[PDB]
Amino acid sequence: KDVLSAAEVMQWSQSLEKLLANQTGQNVFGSFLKSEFSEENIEFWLACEDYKKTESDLLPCKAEEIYKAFVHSDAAKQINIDFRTRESTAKKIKAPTPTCFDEAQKVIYTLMEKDSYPRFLKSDIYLNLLNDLQ
């Protein structure tokens, strides 16, 4: 049973979306973001994915947790969304639906796609993993 291949790790360079669809890719990208003090981005993104599959009754609580942990001004982990996206997200928190964090999530996905994802693909973490598998 193969658990990882050079081919798979090559595929992660195709799009951030392929990297994030692989649990190990998430974990390795995560580790690089953590070394770079930007892991709030992927953690937020994964929390949003987990919010979207949450049962209706627990959305108010989950939304409040995600908001305090990441979005709120006084977050340990404060994500870099713009002021207007933050203000509108804050308003959605008080009566949340499954799409509450879609706007903020999109911003953060883009921030990763355009900044830290390319850098990761040029990191030792990524390039060592890739080459030493071959």
GROMACS .gro file of N, CA, C and O in nm:
model
  536
    1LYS      N    1   0.085  -0.124   0.000
    1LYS     CA    2   0.000   0.000   0.000
    1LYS      C    3   0.086   0.126   0.000
    1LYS      O    4   0.154   0.156   0.100
    2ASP      N    5   0.086   0.197  -0.113
    2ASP     CA    6   0.150   0.327  -0.123
    2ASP      C    7   0.066   0.429  -0.045
    2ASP      O    8  -0.056   0.420  -0.043
    3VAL      N    9   0.132   0.521   0.024
    3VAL     CA   10   0.063   0.624   0.101
    3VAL      C   11   0.094   0.764   0.047
    3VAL      O   12   0.022   0.859   0.077
    4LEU      N   13   0.204   0.777  -0.030
    4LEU     CA   14   0.242   0.901  -0.097
    4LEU      C   15   0.327   0.867  -0.218
    4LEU      O   16   0.397   0.767  -0.219
    5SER      N   17   0.317   0.947  -0.322
    5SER     CA   18   0.403   0.932  -0.443
    5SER      C   19   0.456   1.066  -0.489
    5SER      O   20   0.395   1.172  -0.462
    6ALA      N   21   0.567   1.060  -0.563
    6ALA     CA   22   0.627   1.179  -0.622
    6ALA      C   23   0.522   1.245  -0.716
    6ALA      O   24   0.508   1.368  -0.719
    7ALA      N   25   0.448   1.161  -0.789
    7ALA     CA   26   0.344   1.208  -0.881
    7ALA      C   27   0.244   1.293  -0.805
    7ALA      O   28   0.212   1.403  -0.848
    8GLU      N   29   0.199   1.243  -0.690
    8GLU     CA   30   0.099   1.316  -0.612
    8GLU      C   31   0.150   1.449  -0.564
    8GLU      O   32   0.081   1.549  -0.575
    9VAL      N   33   0.271   1.449  -0.509
    9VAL     CA   34   0.333   1.568  -0.460
    9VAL      C   35   0.358   1.667  -0.578
    9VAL      O   36   0.343   1.787  -0.558
   10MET      N   37   0.395   1.618  -0.698
   10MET     CA   38   0.398   1.704  -0.820
   10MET      C   39   0.263   1.773  -0.849
   10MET      O   40   0.259   1.890  -0.883
   11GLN      N   41   0.153   1.698  -0.841
   11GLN     CA   42   0.019   1.751  -0.861
   11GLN      C   43  -0.023   1.871  -0.774
   11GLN      O   44  -0.105   1.954  -0.816
   12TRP      N   45   0.033   1.879  -0.654
   12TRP     CA   46   0.010   1.990  -0.563
   12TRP      C   47   0.057   2.124  -0.622
   12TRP      O   48   0.008   2.229  -0.579
   13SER      N   49   0.157   2.118  -0.712
   13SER     CA   50   0.199   2.237  -0.788
   13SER      C   51   0.103   2.277  -0.898
   13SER      O   52   0.116   2.384  -0.955
   14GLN      N   53   0.002   2.195  -0.928
   14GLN     CA   54  -0.095   2.232  -1.029
   14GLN      C   55  -0.191   2.347  -0.985
   14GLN      O   56  -0.220   2.437  -1.062
   15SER      N   57  -0.238   2.341  -0.861
   15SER     CA   58  -0.327   2.443  -0.807
   15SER      C   59  -0.334   2.426  -0.658
   15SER      O   60  -0.312   2.315  -0.607
   16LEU      N   61  -0.362   2.535  -0.589
   16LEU     CA   62  -0.378   2.531  -0.447
   16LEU      C   63  -0.491   2.428  -0.415
   16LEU      O   64  -0.484   2.353  -0.316
   17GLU      N   65  -0.593   2.428  -0.499
   17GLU     CA   66  -0.705   2.337  -0.481
   17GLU      C   67  -0.661   2.189  -0.479
   17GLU      O   68  -0.713   2.115  -0.399
   18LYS      N   69  -0.567   2.146  -0.565
   18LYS     CA   70  -0.516   2.008  -0.559
   18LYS      C   71  -0.433   1.985  -0.434
   18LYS      O   72  -0.444   1.882  -0.369
   19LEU      N   73  -0.352   2.083  -0.395
   19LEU     CA   74  -0.277   2.068  -0.271
   19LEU      C   75  -0.373   2.048  -0.149
   19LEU      O   76  -0.352   1.958  -0.064
   20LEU      N   77  -0.476   2.132  -0.141
   20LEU     CA   78  -0.569   2.123  -0.028
   20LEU      C   79  -0.664   2.003  -0.031
   20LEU      O   80  -0.724   1.974   0.071
   21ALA      N   81  -0.681   1.937  -0.146
   21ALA     CA   82  -0.765   1.819  -0.156
   21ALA      C   83  -0.697   1.691  -0.104
   21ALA      O   84  -0.761   1.589  -0.090
   22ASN      N   85  -0.566   1.699  -0.080
   22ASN     CA   86  -0.484   1.592  -0.024
   22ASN      C   87  -0.453   1.623   0.124
   22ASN      O   88  -0.397   1.727   0.159
   23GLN      N   89  -0.490   1.531   0.212
   23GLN     CA   90  -0.474   1.553   0.356
   23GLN      C   91  -0.327   1.576   0.391
   23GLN      O   92  -0.291   1.666   0.470
   24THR      N   93  -0.239   1.497   0.331
   24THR     CA   94  -0.097   1.516   0.356
   24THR      C   95  -0.043   1.646   0.300
   24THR      O   96   0.038   1.714   0.364
   25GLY      N   97  -0.092   1.686   0.183
   25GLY     CA   98  -0.059   1.819   0.127
   25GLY      C   99  -0.100   1.930   0.219
   25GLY      O  100  -0.023   2.021   0.248
   26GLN      N  101  -0.221   1.919   0.273
   26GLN     CA  102  -0.265   2.015   0.374
   26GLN      C  103  -0.171   2.023   0.492
   26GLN      O  104  -0.136   2.132   0.535
   27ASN      N  105  -0.133   1.906   0.545
   27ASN     CA  106  -0.046   1.896   0.658
   27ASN      C  107   0.093   1.956   0.630
   27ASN      O  108   0.152   2.019   0.717
   28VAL      N  109   0.150   1.927   0.513
   28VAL     CA  110   0.284   1.979   0.479
   28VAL      C  111   0.279   2.133   0.450
   28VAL      O  112   0.359   2.210   0.498
   29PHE      N  113   0.178   2.175   0.378
   29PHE     CA  114   0.157   2.320   0.355
   29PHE      C  115   0.133   2.395   0.488
   29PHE      O  116   0.198   2.496   0.517
   30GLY      N  117   0.044   2.339   0.569
   30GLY     CA  118   0.026   2.382   0.705
   30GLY      C  119   0.153   2.402   0.783
   30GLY      O  120   0.167   2.503   0.853
   31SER      N  121   0.244   2.302   0.777
   31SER     CA  122   0.368   2.310   0.850
   31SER      C  123   0.453   2.428   0.800
   31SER      O  124   0.514   2.499   0.878
   32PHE      N  125   0.459   2.445   0.670
   32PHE     CA  126   0.531   2.562   0.608
   32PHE      C  127   0.472   2.698   0.649
   32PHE      O  128   0.544   2.788   0.685
   33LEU      N  129   0.340   2.709   0.651
   33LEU     CA  130   0.272   2.831   0.696
   33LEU      C  131   0.303   2.859   0.843
   33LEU      O  132   0.334   2.973   0.881
   34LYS      N  133   0.302   2.754   0.925
   34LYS     CA  134   0.336   2.766   1.065
   34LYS      C  135   0.480   2.816   1.080
   34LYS      O  136   0.503   2.911   1.153
   35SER      N  137   0.574   2.759   1.006
   35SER     CA  138   0.712   2.814   1.008
   35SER      C  139   0.723   2.961   0.965
   35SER      O  140   0.822   3.027   1.000
   36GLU      N  141   0.622   3.010   0.892
   36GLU     CA  142   0.614   3.145   0.832
   36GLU      C  143   0.519   3.242   0.903
   36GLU      O  144   0.490   3.350   0.849
   37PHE      N  145   0.467   3.200   1.019
   37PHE     CA  146   0.364   3.269   1.096
   37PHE      C  147   0.241   3.313   1.016
   37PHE      O  148   0.190   3.423   1.038
   38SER      N  149   0.191   3.227   0.927
   38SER     CA  150   0.071   3.256   0.850
   38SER      C  151  -0.028   3.140   0.849
   38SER      O  152  -0.116   3.134   0.762
   39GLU      N  153  -0.016   3.050   0.947
   39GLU     CA  154  -0.100   2.931   0.951
   39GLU      C  155  -0.245   2.961   0.985
   39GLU      O  156  -0.328   2.879   0.956
   40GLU      N  157  -0.275   3.080   1.040
   40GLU     CA  158  -0.414   3.123   1.063
   40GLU      C  159  -0.495   3.115   0.935
   40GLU      O  160  -0.615   3.093   0.939
   41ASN      N  161  -0.428   3.128   0.821
   41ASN     CA  162  -0.498   3.125   0.692
   41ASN      C  163  -0.555   2.990   0.660
   41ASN      O  164  -0.672   2.979   0.619
   42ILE      N  165  -0.474   2.885   0.673
   42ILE     CA  166  -0.521   2.751   0.637
   42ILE      C  167  -0.613   2.697   0.746
   42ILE      O  168  -0.710   2.627   0.719
   43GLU      N  169  -0.584   2.732   0.869
   43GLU     CA  170  -0.668   2.692   0.980
   43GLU      C  171  -0.805   2.752   0.972
   43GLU      O  172  -0.906   2.683   0.989
   44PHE      N  173  -0.811   2.882   0.938
   44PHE     CA  174  -0.938   2.945   0.909
   44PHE      C  175  -1.010   2.877   0.798
   44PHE      O  176  -1.128   2.845   0.810
   45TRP      N  177  -0.938   2.853   0.687
   45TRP     CA  178  -0.998   2.789   0.571
   45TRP      C  179  -1.058   2.650   0.606
   45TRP      O  180  -1.170   2.621   0.573
   46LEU      N  181  -0.980   2.566   0.674
   46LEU     CA  182  -1.028   2.435   0.721
   46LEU      C  183  -1.145   2.446   0.821
   46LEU      O  184  -1.235   2.362   0.821
   47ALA      N  185  -1.144   2.548   0.908
   47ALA     CA  186  -1.258   2.569   0.999
   47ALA      C  187  -1.386   2.601   0.921
   47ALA      O  188  -1.497   2.561   0.957
   48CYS      N  189  -1.370   2.677   0.813
   48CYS     CA  190  -1.486   2.715   0.732
   48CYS      C  191  -1.545   2.593   0.663
   48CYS      O  192  -1.666   2.582   0.653
   49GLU      N  193  -1.459   2.502   0.617
   49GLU     CA  194  -1.501   2.377   0.553
   49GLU      C  195  -1.580   2.295   0.654
   49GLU      O  196  -1.687   2.245   0.625
   50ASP      N  197  -1.528   2.291   0.775
   50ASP     CA  198  -1.591   2.218   0.883
   50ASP      C  199  -1.721   2.286   0.932
   50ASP      O  200  -1.820   2.217   0.966
   51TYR      N  201  -1.727   2.419   0.923
   51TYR     CA  202  -1.851   2.492   0.955
   51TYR      C  203  -1.966   2.455   0.860
   51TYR      O  204  -2.082   2.441   0.901
   52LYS      N  205  -1.930   2.436   0.733
   52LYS     CA  206  -2.027   2.412   0.625
   52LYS      C  207  -2.093   2.277   0.631
   52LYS      O  208  -2.200   2.260   0.575
   53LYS      N  209  -2.029   2.181   0.697
   53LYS     CA  210  -2.089   2.050   0.718
   53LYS      C  211  -2.144   2.038   0.862
   53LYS      O  212  -2.164   1.928   0.910
   54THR      N  213  -2.165   2.150   0.932
   54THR     CA  214  -2.210   2.145   1.073
   54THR      C  215  -2.362   2.152   1.075
   54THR      O  216  -2.425   2.223   0.992
   55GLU      N  217  -2.421   2.080   1.171
   55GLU     CA  218  -2.566   2.071   1.185
   55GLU      C  219  -2.621   2.207   1.220
   55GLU      O  220  -2.559   2.281   1.296
   56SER      N  221  -2.737   2.236   1.165
   56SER     CA  222  -2.801   2.367   1.174
   56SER      C  223  -2.806   2.429   1.315
   56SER      O  224  -2.772   2.545   1.333
   57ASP      N  225  -2.851   2.350   1.414
   57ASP     CA  226  -2.854   2.390   1.556
   57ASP      C  227  -2.720   2.439   1.615
   57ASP      O  228  -2.720   2.515   1.711
   58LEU      N  229  -2.606   2.394   1.562
   58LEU     CA  230  -2.477   2.432   1.619
   58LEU      C  231  -2.403   2.540   1.540
   58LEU      O  232  -2.288   2.572   1.570
   59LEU      N  233  -2.470   2.597   1.440
   59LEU     CA  234  -2.409   2.703   1.359
   59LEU      C  235  -2.390   2.831   1.441
   59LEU      O  236  -2.282   2.890   1.438
   60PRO      N  237  -2.491   2.873   1.520
   60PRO     CA  238  -2.462   2.994   1.598
   60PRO      C  239  -2.332   2.982   1.682
   60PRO      O  240  -2.246   3.072   1.674
   61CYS      N  241  -2.316   2.871   1.754
   61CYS     CA  242  -2.195   2.845   1.835
   61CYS      C  243  -2.064   2.832   1.757
   61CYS      O  244  -1.963   2.890   1.796
   62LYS      N  245  -2.064   2.751   1.652
   62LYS     CA  246  -1.949   2.737   1.562
   62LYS      C  247  -1.910   2.871   1.497
   62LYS      O  248  -1.792   2.904   1.488
   63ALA      N  249  -2.008   2.944   1.448
   63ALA     CA  250  -1.979   3.075   1.387
   63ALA      C  251  -1.913   3.167   1.491
   63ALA      O  252  -1.812   3.231   1.462
   64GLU      N  253  -1.971   3.174   1.612
   64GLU     CA  254  -1.911   3.254   1.719
   64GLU      C  255  -1.770   3.211   1.752
   64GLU      O  256  -1.686   3.296   1.777
   65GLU      N  257  -1.743   3.080   1.754
   65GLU     CA  258  -1.607   3.029   1.782
   65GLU      C  259  -1.506   3.069   1.672
   65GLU      O  260  -1.393   3.106   1.699
   66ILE      N  261  -1.547   3.054   1.547
   66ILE     CA  262  -1.460   3.085   1.435
   66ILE      C  263  -1.432   3.236   1.432
   66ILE      O  264  -1.318   3.279   1.411
   67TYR      N  265  -1.537   3.314   1.457
   67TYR     CA  266  -1.525   3.458   1.463
   67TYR      C  267  -1.427   3.507   1.572
   67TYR      O  268  -1.338   3.588   1.545
   68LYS      N  269  -1.438   3.453   1.693
   68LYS     CA  270  -1.347   3.495   1.800
   68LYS      C  271  -1.203   3.447   1.774
   68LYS      O  272  -1.108   3.518   1.802
   69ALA      N  273  -1.189   3.328   1.719
   69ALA     CA  274  -1.058   3.269   1.702
   69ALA      C  275  -0.977   3.332   1.587
   69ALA      O  276  -0.857   3.334   1.592
   70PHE      N  277  -1.044   3.389   1.487
   70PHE     CA  278  -0.978   3.424   1.358
   70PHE      C  279  -1.014   3.563   1.304
   70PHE      O  280  -0.930   3.632   1.251
   71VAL      N  281  -1.139   3.602   1.317
   71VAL     CA  282  -1.193   3.716   1.243
   71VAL      C  283  -1.196   3.838   1.329
   71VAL      O  284  -1.166   3.949   1.282
   72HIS      N  285  -1.233   3.819   1.455
   72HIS     CA  286  -1.250   3.929   1.547
   72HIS      C  287  -1.116   3.999   1.568
   72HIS      O  288  -1.009   3.936   1.573
   73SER      N  289  -1.128   4.131   1.581
   73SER     CA  290  -1.019   4.224   1.606
   73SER      C  291  -0.920   4.176   1.713
   73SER      O  292  -0.800   4.201   1.704
   74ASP      N  293  -0.970   4.104   1.812
   74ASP     CA  294  -0.891   4.059   1.925
   74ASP      C  295  -0.859   3.911   1.916
   74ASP      O  296  -0.835   3.848   2.020
   75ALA      N  297  -0.859   3.856   1.794
   75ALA     CA  298  -0.818   3.717   1.770
   75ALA      C  299  -0.670   3.702   1.793
   75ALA      O  300  -0.592   3.792   1.761
   76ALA      N  301  -0.628   3.588   1.847
   76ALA     CA  302  -0.486   3.552   1.850
   76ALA      C  303  -0.438   3.536   1.707
   76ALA      O  304  -0.325   3.573   1.672
   77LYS      N  305  -0.528   3.484   1.625
   77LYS     CA  306  -0.500   3.439   1.491
   77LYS      C  307  -0.552   3.533   1.380
   77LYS      O  308  -0.582   3.484   1.273
   78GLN      N  309  -0.555   3.666   1.399
   78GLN     CA  310  -0.645   3.750   1.315
   78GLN      C  311  -0.611   3.747   1.166
   78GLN      O  312  -0.503   3.789   1.123
   79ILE      N  313  -0.707   3.699   1.089
   79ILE     CA  314  -0.688   3.680   0.947
   79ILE      C  315  -0.692   3.817   0.878
   79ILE      O  316  -0.758   3.912   0.926
   80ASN      N  317  -0.617   3.826   0.767
   80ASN     CA  318  -0.599   3.950   0.692
   80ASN      C  319  -0.707   3.965   0.585
   80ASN      O  320  -0.680   3.955   0.465
   81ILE      N  321  -0.830   3.986   0.627
   81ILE     CA  322  -0.937   4.025   0.535
   81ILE      C  323  -0.947   4.174   0.550
   81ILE      O  324  -0.896   4.229   0.648
   82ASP      N  325  -1.008   4.238   0.451
   82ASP     CA  326  -1.028   4.381   0.453
   82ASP      C  327  -1.142   4.412   0.551
   82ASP      O  328  -1.228   4.329   0.582
   83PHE      N  329  -1.141   4.536   0.595
   83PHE     CA  330  -1.238   4.594   0.685
   83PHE      C  331  -1.386   4.570   0.650
   83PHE      O  332  -1.465   4.541   0.740
   84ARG      N  333  -1.422   4.582   0.521
   84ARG     CA  334  -1.563   4.570   0.479
   84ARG      C  335  -1.607   4.425   0.484
   84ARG      O  336  -1.719   4.396   0.527
   85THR      N  337  -1.521   4.334   0.443
   85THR     CA  338  -1.550   4.191   0.456
   85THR      C  339  -1.565   4.148   0.604
   85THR      O  340  -1.658   4.074   0.641
   86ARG      N  341  -1.476   4.202   0.688
   86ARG     CA  342  -1.483   4.180   0.833
   86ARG      C  343  -1.615   4.229   0.891
   86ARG      O  344  -1.683   4.154   0.959
   87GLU      N  345  -1.652   4.355   0.863
   87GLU     CA  346  -1.777   4.413   0.911
   87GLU      C  347  -1.901   4.334   0.865
   87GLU      O  348  -1.993   4.310   0.946
   88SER      N  349  -1.905   4.296   0.738
   88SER     CA  350  -2.019   4.215   0.692
   88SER      C  351  -2.023   4.074   0.753
   88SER      O  352  -2.132   4.023   0.784
   89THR      N  353  -1.906   4.012   0.773
   89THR     CA  354  -1.899   3.880   0.838
   89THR      C  355  -1.954   3.891   0.984
   89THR      O  356  -2.034   3.807   1.028
   90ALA      N  357  -1.910   3.995   1.056
   90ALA     CA  358  -1.952   4.020   1.191
   90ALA      C  359  -2.105   4.029   1.202
   90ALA      O  360  -2.165   3.981   1.297
   91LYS      N  361  -2.167   4.092   1.103
   91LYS     CA  362  -2.311   4.103   1.095
   91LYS      C  363  -2.377   3.968   1.070
   91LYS      O  364  -2.485   3.942   1.124
   92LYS      N  365  -2.316   3.883   0.987
   92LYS     CA  366  -2.372   3.749   0.960
   92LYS      C  367  -2.368   3.658   1.085
   92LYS      O  368  -2.446   3.563   1.095
   93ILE      N  369  -2.279   3.689   1.180
   93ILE     CA  370  -2.250   3.604   1.296
   93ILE      C  371  -2.371   3.595   1.388
   93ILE      O  372  -2.392   3.493   1.452
   94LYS      N  373  -2.449   3.702   1.393
   94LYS     CA  374  -2.560   3.713   1.486
   94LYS      C  375  -2.680   3.628   1.444
   94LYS      O  376  -2.768   3.603   1.526
   95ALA      N  377  -2.689   3.589   1.316
   95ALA     CA  378  -2.791   3.493   1.270
   95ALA      C  379  -2.738   3.415   1.152
   95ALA      O  380  -2.780   3.437   1.039
   96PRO      N  381  -2.642   3.325   1.177
   96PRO     CA  382  -2.564   3.265   1.071
   96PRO      C  383  -2.632   3.153   0.990
   96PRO      O  384  -2.713   3.078   1.044
   97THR      N  385  -2.596   3.145   0.862
   97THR     CA  386  -2.637   3.038   0.774
   97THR      C  387  -2.511   2.966   0.731
   97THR      O  388  -2.400   3.012   0.760
   98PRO      N  389  -2.527   2.852   0.659
   98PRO     CA  390  -2.410   2.780   0.609
   98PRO      C  391  -2.314   2.860   0.518
   98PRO      O  392  -2.203   2.816   0.496
   99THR      N  393  -2.356   2.975   0.466
   99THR     CA  394  -2.272   3.054   0.375
   99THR      C  395  -2.209   3.175   0.444
   99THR      O  396  -2.149   3.261   0.378
  100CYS      N  397  -2.223   3.181   0.576
  100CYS     CA  398  -2.176   3.293   0.654
  100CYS      C  399  -2.030   3.339   0.621
  100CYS      O  400  -2.004   3.460   0.608
  101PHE      N  401  -1.938   3.243   0.612
  101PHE     CA  402  -1.795   3.272   0.599
  101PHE      C  403  -1.740   3.264   0.456
  101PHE      O  404  -1.618   3.277   0.438
  102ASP      N  405  -1.830   3.243   0.358
  102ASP     CA  406  -1.792   3.230   0.216
  102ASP      C  407  -1.711   3.349   0.162
  102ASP      O  408  -1.615   3.330   0.088
  103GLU      N  409  -1.746   3.470   0.201
  103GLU     CA  410  -1.676   3.588   0.153
  103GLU      C  411  -1.535   3.595   0.212
  103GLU      O  412  -1.435   3.612   0.141
  104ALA      N  413  -1.527   3.579   0.344
  104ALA     CA  414  -1.399   3.581   0.413
  104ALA      C  415  -1.311   3.465   0.370
  104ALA      O  416  -1.189   3.480   0.353
  105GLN      N  417  -1.374   3.353   0.341
  105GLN     CA  418  -1.300   3.231   0.305
  105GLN      C  419  -1.235   3.254   0.166
  105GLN      O  420  -1.123   3.217   0.141
  106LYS      N  421  -1.313   3.314   0.076
  106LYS     CA  422  -1.266   3.344  -0.056
  106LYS      C  423  -1.147   3.438  -0.054
  106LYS      O  424  -1.050   3.414  -0.120
  107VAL      N  425  -1.153   3.545   0.024
  107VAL     CA  426  -1.041   3.635   0.040
  107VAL      C  427  -0.917   3.557   0.084
  107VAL      O  428  -0.805   3.572   0.028
  108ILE      N  429  -0.933   3.477   0.189
  108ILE     CA  430  -0.818   3.405   0.245
  108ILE      C  431  -0.766   3.301   0.146
  108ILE      O  432  -0.649   3.284   0.134
  109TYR      N  433  -0.853   3.233   0.074
  109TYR     CA  434  -0.807   3.140  -0.029
  109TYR      C  435  -0.720   3.211  -0.132
  109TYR      O  436  -0.614   3.164  -0.169
  110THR      N  437  -0.766   3.329  -0.176
  110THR     CA  438  -0.687   3.408  -0.270
  110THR      C  439  -0.553   3.451  -0.213
  110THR      O  440  -0.448   3.445  -0.284
  111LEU      N  441  -0.553   3.495  -0.088
  111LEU     CA  442  -0.429   3.535  -0.025
  111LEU      C  443  -0.324   3.422  -0.026
  111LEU      O  444  -0.203   3.444  -0.050
  112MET      N  445  -0.372   3.303   0.004
  112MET     CA  446  -0.287   3.182  -0.003
  112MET      C  447  -0.246   3.153  -0.151
  112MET      O  448  -0.132   3.136  -0.182
  113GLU      N  449  -0.342   3.152  -0.240
  113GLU     CA  450  -0.315   3.119  -0.381
  113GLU      C  451  -0.208   3.206  -0.442
  113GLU      O  452  -0.125   3.157  -0.513
  114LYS      N  453  -0.209   3.334  -0.408
  114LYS     CA  454  -0.127   3.432  -0.473
  114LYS      C  455   0.001   3.463  -0.399
  114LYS      O  456   0.095   3.508  -0.458
  115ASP      N  457   0.010   3.431  -0.272
  115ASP     CA  458   0.129   3.466  -0.194
  115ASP      C  459   0.203   3.343  -0.136
  115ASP      O  460   0.312   3.308  -0.178
  116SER      N  461   0.143   3.275  -0.039
  116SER     CA  462   0.218   3.175   0.035
  116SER      C  463   0.226   3.039  -0.040
  116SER      O  464   0.325   2.969  -0.024
  117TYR      N  465   0.125   3.005  -0.120
  117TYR     CA  466   0.127   2.885  -0.200
  117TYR      C  467   0.245   2.883  -0.302
  117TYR      O  468   0.321   2.785  -0.303
  118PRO      N  469   0.261   2.988  -0.386
  118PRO     CA  470   0.382   2.992  -0.469
  118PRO      C  471   0.514   2.980  -0.393
  118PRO      O  472   0.604   2.911  -0.438
  119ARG      N  473   0.527   3.048  -0.279
  119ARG     CA  474   0.649   3.042  -0.198
  119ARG      C  475   0.675   2.901  -0.147
  119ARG      O  476   0.789   2.855  -0.147
  120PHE      N  477   0.569   2.835  -0.101
  120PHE     CA  478   0.576   2.695  -0.057
  120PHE      C  479   0.634   2.603  -0.166
  120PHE      O  480   0.717   2.511  -0.138
  121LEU      N  481   0.590   2.626  -0.290
  121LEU     CA  482   0.634   2.542  -0.399
  121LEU      C  483   0.779   2.562  -0.430
  121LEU      O  484   0.838   2.480  -0.499
  122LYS      N  485   0.837   2.672  -0.381
  122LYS     CA  486   0.981   2.694  -0.390
  122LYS      C  487   1.056   2.667  -0.260
  122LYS      O  488   1.176   2.694  -0.251
  123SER      N  489   0.988   2.613  -0.159
  123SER     CA  490   1.051   2.585  -0.028
  123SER      C  491   1.128   2.454  -0.026
  123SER      O  492   1.103   2.365  -0.105
  124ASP      N  493   1.217   2.443   0.070
  124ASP     CA  494   1.288   2.319   0.095
  124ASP      C  495   1.193   2.208   0.133
  124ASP      O  496   1.211   2.098   0.086
  125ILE      N  497   1.091   2.242   0.213
  125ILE     CA  498   0.992   2.147   0.259
  125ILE      C  499   0.937   2.074   0.139
  125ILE      O  500   0.949   1.951   0.130
  126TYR      N  501   0.877   2.150   0.047
  126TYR     CA  502   0.819   2.095  -0.074
  126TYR      C  503   0.921   2.025  -0.165
  126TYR      O  504   0.902   1.910  -0.202
  127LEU      N  505   1.029   2.094  -0.200
  127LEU     CA  506   1.122   2.044  -0.302
  127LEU      C  507   1.201   1.922  -0.253
  127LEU      O  508   1.217   1.827  -0.329
  128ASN      N  509   1.243   1.921  -0.126
  128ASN     CA  510   1.301   1.799  -0.063
  128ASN      C  511   1.206   1.682  -0.067
  128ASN      O  512   1.243   1.575  -0.112
  129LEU      N  513   1.082   1.703  -0.022
  129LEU     CA  514   0.983   1.595  -0.021
  129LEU      C  515   0.970   1.536  -0.161
  129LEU      O  516   0.980   1.415  -0.180
  130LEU      N  517   0.950   1.624  -0.259
  130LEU     CA  518   0.932   1.586  -0.398
  130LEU      C  519   1.049   1.504  -0.453
  130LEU      O  520   1.030   1.394  -0.505
  131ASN      N  521   1.170   1.557  -0.437
  131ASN     CA  522   1.288   1.497  -0.498
  131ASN      C  523   1.331   1.367  -0.430
  131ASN      O  524   1.364   1.270  -0.498
  132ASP      N  525   1.326   1.365  -0.298
  132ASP     CA  526   1.370   1.248  -0.221
  132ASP      C  527   1.274   1.128  -0.237
  132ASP      O  528   1.311   1.015  -0.207
  133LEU      N  529   1.152   1.154  -0.284
  133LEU     CA  530   1.059   1.045  -0.322
  133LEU      C  531   1.101   0.975  -0.453
  133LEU      O  532   1.056   0.866  -0.481
  134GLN      N  533   1.185   1.043  -0.531
  134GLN     CA  534   1.236   0.994  -0.659
  134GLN      C  535   1.382   0.961  -0.647
  134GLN      O  536   1.413   0.861  -0.588
   0.00000   0.00000   0.00000
